[PDB]
Amino acid sequence: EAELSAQIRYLTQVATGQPHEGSSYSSRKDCQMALKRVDYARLKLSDVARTCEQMLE
Amino acid sequence: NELQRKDALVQKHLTKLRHWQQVLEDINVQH
Amino acid sequence: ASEERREIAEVNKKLKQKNQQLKQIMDQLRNLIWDINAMLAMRN
Asked: What is its main location (chain C)?
């Protein structure tokens, strides 16, 4: 009982902010977005390799 | 000779292009 | 010689065909260098 009562005392003064607005989104969206840009390089580099694989014949 | 030079340029292209294809894939598997 | 001219035409046809393989490469290589710069320059 004391340990839980300690938590409430711990919570009361240091915490209990109503909302939170951390908003770790401007990095998440642009990360996968950067990967999509990297992915666009993947396929098109390979297509070039296929195209110049035809050069060898 | 011109065709031989053309093919030689290709071989320079492919190995370099293939080399880049490896690292780009490598940067993808790491994500 | 007539036969020699024929071989030149065959070489030209092979070279011309190889050139077609080459033109697509530039367009692809050109397109990629176009796309990478356009995508990056807009970066935030």
From this structure: nucleus
